[PDB]
Design a protein around this ligand. Structure first.
Ligand SMILES: Nc1ncnc2c1ncn2[C@@H]1O[C@H](COP(=O)(O)OP(=O)(O)OP(=O)(O)O)[C@@H](O)[C@H]1O
Ligand SMILES: [Ca+2]
Ligand SMILES: [Ca+2]
Ligand SMILES: [Ca+2]
Ligand SMILES: [Ca+2]
Ligand SMILES: [Ca+2]
Length: 901
DNA sequence: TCGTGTAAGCAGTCCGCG
DNA sequence: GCGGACTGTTTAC
């Protein structure tokens, strides 16, 4: 095999590198890497090294890495640019793995771990680590074993060994229901005392040193607790054995208000799954507890126990230990599904960065562009300081709030990355400027043509056309990767809908699921077999199709996120290629593109409908248009359609064979007008939306910008078995809206769009009648809670105190002098409920940590003083009034003359 | 919430508006 | 009672 790195570190003048050698063995080595940096030099001087603008450079080879750094300082002191990769370990990887890395994940040690720590006096601070570590479960990816380190004796209780036989049994037999598929992979080690546990743990760690280290809040809790606990018992030298190079650094994480500390372990790549999840999942959740995310991702029941976690070990050590092991498995099950670890290795190895740098698109792209330029003996510029400056972004059209019956939407494929490619936007492709006219002149094609030589953006920038810049070139490579995976994602989704259809007529038989690749559209032979399967088989196949789809989604969307990130990075001062001329060239060209194409689509449709000045494009945002298709449908007449799917076929055909050609001609002209390098504005039909044929549903509605709902039948060529609501901005989509409210609002919207006003009124009336019975958590609002100290004035609210913060302050007074009451955590989410007049808590709201039950001390009182009227009015009726007025519709029946009978 | 960007919605506070 | 100015927050792209 080809060799590939695992981890890399600079330590003084040495690179420390852990790698897989040519026989597949893990190795470590210390290299006294002599880095090279660069300086401009005269034209008379012969060299093969040039900067990105074509000016000659001399390479300067240093005796060692500190010399290179001292040189950089001195070049600033002199006031001259010091060129080249100043992150020396990235240059080391480029020199050492000067080819496309083919990695083999089965050789990479991925460690999932979780610890337990019993604490009577509140939350155990990782920086103090004053309490014993009484459980560690550490799963190893190479051994495929869960190693359990169980403390039997501590100051807080002596306990018996955990029993794997009881762990395996059903909850209903008084067992812990530890999944049978992992029971045999458990290797359990009890310990007389903590020192022995820890020492054995460190010995194990040295034998099985993690390359990738993950878990749930391992970076903010587990890793620092273990490091500081060991440090306090045995001293620093011993705690540092968690690093395979014996180097660790207390690293302080800063934000706008406050800071915390983490322990950087040199030669380990820490990928905390909570952060993997926040970056790669594209969800915004009301809670990030493991039980909550587990429930959401896997539909696994919350892990149940009695009494506080501070008493669980002494009351039920059996369950204590089992739940520690299930906690580790849950993360592994989430990864099996989401595949973020797999995604992280792909991007990190593609870029030639430390794997943990996948969290920084700046670092990721700095490494990709560096490696790309180095292949041509080109030398990257020095990073400079820049002051943060605001700059303009996308155009969003003001919609006329209304119902809209038949809608077809279109939007640009990978808009900003395509803009970059089409225009050739790159630091080294800037050719100059031209005198700009107001944007509306370009939009309406009355402005003078910017250039007959260079490719232009309407912000005034001109770019070369003789060659692709490094940014277009590298963004294209990742875009193509993205497109591939999205194809798989969409095929699995289409395959998904075939199985749902078949499930309308499951066969009474015993059989098995077909072994197939869900990333490719099912052949006819597969379609035939499917129609003969049992519901059990079809269902297992569906689950599998959706897993394939999720796998595809992770691969495609985060590649999109990365390429969109590069466009964004051009506007971040820390980016080596920061330049508001290029960031703004992107955004401004997008504004033109959308408004230009709005004009063309309107012109085109007015022509086919024999009209003038009529607006068919009702809305658009950044790179999308929404076309009212009422008149197209009416031109054939609603009577002429067999069923819903028949008019959906007709619009699909119309979009494909009429609209997209018109759109493409419109953009081809724009390309030529802007003299761009290449036509890459591809506006594919997104959604086909409308009411069920012959129903009283309104099909869709807008309330305003970034707020609308569509009843969709076809999405990017996926024909649904059942219609599906696309909803954006509305309260059903926000993590702040109570869970039960999201659900009820969504059903109101479904009835509105599919069934009509009357259906809506029937549901409204019932929801108002019964909502008081809803579980308090299900009807609580949710908010992030920042700056709790700034508004805290003697435990009471200061001036301008946000509502949710008021709730927290109410909570804190209600639980004061209580060591085991859950504390609200600064910067994390809280549930919020309004309180009726004259309640015990002496205020109008109360808030507690989200994803949890409110402590039993005050629960009964909160339930009793809960203000259901205020709650209903703010979270449900207000939004619904918004939806309904916009749609010109009544949620309560108005009086008529028939009332007289 | 350490980690690419801007546009824009909404809830709430404070307070004007004769 | 509703809006503008402002803070805090949370999406849509
Ligand atoms: N997270 C983001 N960061 C930076 N820019 C973004 C982000 N999301 C969207 N944009 C910008 O808005 C444009 C349109 O967004 P959209 O969600 O349609 O993605 P896209 O890049 O066009 O990909 P797709 O082909 O899936 O539509 C992007 O091309 C860019
Ligand atoms: Ca735990
Ligand atoms: Ca798009
Ligand atoms: Ca069948
Ligand atoms: Ca879009
Ligand atoms: Ca598309």
């Amino acid at each position: 095999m080809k060799e590939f790195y695992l981890t890399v570190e600079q330590i003084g003048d040495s690179i420390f590198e852990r790698y897989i050698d040519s026989n597949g063995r893990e190795r470590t080595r210390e290299v006294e890497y002599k880095p090279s940096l660069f300086a401009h030099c005269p034209e008379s001087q012969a060299t093969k090294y040039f900067d990105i603008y074509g000016k000659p450079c001399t390479r300067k080879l240093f005796a060692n890495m500190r010399d290179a750094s001292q040189w950089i300082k001195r070049m600033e002191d002199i006031g001259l640019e010091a060129l080249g990769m100043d992150d020396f370990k990235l240059a080391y990887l480029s020199d050492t793995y000067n080819y496309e890395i083919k990695y083999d994940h089965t050789k990479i040690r991925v460690a999932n771990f979780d610890i337990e720590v019993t604490s009577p006096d509140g939350f155990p601070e990782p920086s103090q680590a004053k309490h014993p570590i009484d459980a560690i479960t550490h799963y190893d990816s190479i051994d495929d074993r869960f190693y359990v380190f169980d403390l039997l004796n501590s100051p807080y209780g002596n306990v018996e060994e955990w029993s794997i036989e009881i762990a395996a049994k059903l909850q209903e037999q008084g067992g812990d229901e530890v999944p049978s598929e992992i029971i045999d992979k458990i290797i359990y080690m009890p310990f007389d005392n903590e020192k022995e546990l820890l020492m054995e743990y460190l010995n194990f760690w040295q034998q099985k040193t993690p390359v990738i280290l993950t878990g749930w809040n391992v970076e903010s809790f587990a890793i620092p607790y273990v490091y500081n606990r060991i440090k306090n018992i045995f001293g620093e030298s011993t705690a540092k054995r968690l690093s395979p190079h014996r180097k660790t650094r207390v690293k302080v994480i800063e934000n706008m208000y406050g800071s915390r500390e983490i322990i950087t372990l040199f030669g380990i790549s820490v990928l905390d799954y909570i952060d993997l999840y926040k970056k790669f999942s594209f969800t915004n959740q009301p809670s990030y507890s493991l039980d909550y995310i587990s429930e959401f991702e896997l539909n696994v029941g919350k892990l149940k126990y009695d009494g506080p976690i501070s008493k669980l070990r002494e009351s039920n050590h059996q369950r204590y230990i089992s739940y520690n092991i299930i906690a580790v498995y849950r993360v592994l099950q989430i990864d099996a599904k989401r595949q973020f670890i797999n995604l992280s290795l792909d991007m990190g190895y593609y870029a030639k960065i430390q794997i943990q740098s996948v969290f920084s698109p700046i670092k990721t792209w700095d490494a990709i562009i560096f490696n790309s330029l180095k292949e041509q003996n080109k030398v990257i510029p020095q990073g400079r300081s820049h002051p943060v400056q605001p700059y303009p972004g996308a155009f969003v059209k003001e919609p006329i709030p209304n119902r809209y019956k038949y809608v077809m939407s279109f939007d640009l494929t990978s808009a900003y990355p395509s803009i970059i490619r089409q225009v050739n936007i790159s630091p080294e492709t800037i050719a100059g400027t031209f005198k700009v006219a107001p944007l509306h002149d370009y939009i309406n094609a009355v402005a003078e043509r910017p250039s007959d030589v260079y490719s232009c953006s309407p912000n005034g920038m001109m770019y070369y056309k003789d060659r692709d810049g490094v940014v277009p070139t590298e963004i294209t490579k990742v875009f193509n990767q993205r497109k591939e995976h999205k194809g798989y994602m969409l095929a699995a989704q289409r395959n998904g809908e075939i199985i749902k259809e078949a499930l309308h007529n499951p066969n009474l038989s015993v059989d098995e699921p077909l072994d197939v690749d869900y990333r490719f559209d099912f052949s006819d032979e597969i379609k035939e077999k499917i129609k003969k399967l049992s519901a059990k088989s079809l269902n297992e196949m569906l689950f599998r199709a959706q897993r394939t789809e999720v796998a595809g989604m992770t691969a495609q969307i985060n590649r999109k996120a990365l390429i969109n990130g590069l466009a964004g990075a051009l506007g971040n001062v820390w980016f080596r290629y920061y330049d508001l001329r290029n960031a703004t060239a992107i955004t401004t060209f997008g504004q033109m593109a959308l408004q230009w194409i709005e004009r063309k689509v309107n012109e085109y449709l007015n022509e086919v409908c024999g009209t003038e000045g009529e607006a068919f494009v009702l809305y658009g945002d950044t790179d999308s248009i929404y076309v009212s298709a009422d008149k197209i449908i009416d031109k054939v007449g609603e009577s002429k359609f067999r069923d819903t799917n028949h008019w959906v076929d007709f619009l699909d055909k119309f979009a494909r064979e009429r609209m997209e050609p018109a759109i493409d001609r419109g953009f081809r002209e724009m390309c030529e007008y802007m003299n761009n390098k290449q036509h890459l504005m591809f506006m594919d039909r997104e959604a086909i939306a409308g009411p069920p044929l012959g129903s009283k549903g309104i099909g869709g509605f807008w309330t305003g910008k970034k707020r609308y709902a569509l009843n969709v039948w076809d999405m990017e060529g996926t024909r649904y078995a059942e219609p599906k609501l696309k909803i954006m901005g509305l309260e059903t989509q926000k993590s702040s809206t109570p869970k039960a409210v999201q659900k009820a609002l969504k059903e109101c919207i479904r009835r509105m769009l599919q069934e009509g006003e009357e259906s809506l009124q029937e549901y409204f009336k019932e929801f108002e009648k019964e909502f008081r019975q809803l579980n308090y958590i299900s009807i609580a609002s949710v908010s992030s809670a920042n700056n709790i100290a700034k508004y805290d004035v003697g435990g009471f609210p200061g001036p301008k105190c946000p509502f949710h913060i008021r709730g927290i302050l109410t909570y804190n007074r209600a639980i004061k002098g209580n060591i085991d009451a859950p504390q609200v955590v600064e910067g994390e989410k809280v549930y919020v409920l309004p309180l009726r007049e004259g309640n015990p808590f002496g205020d109008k709201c109360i808030a507690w940590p989200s994803g949890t039950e409110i402590t039993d001390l005050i629960k009964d009182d909160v339930l009793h003083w809960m203000d259901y009227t205020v709650l209903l009015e703010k979270t449900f009726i207000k939004p619904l009034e918004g939806f309904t007025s916009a749609a010109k519709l009544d949620y309560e029946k108005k009086a008529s003359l028939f009332d007289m009978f």
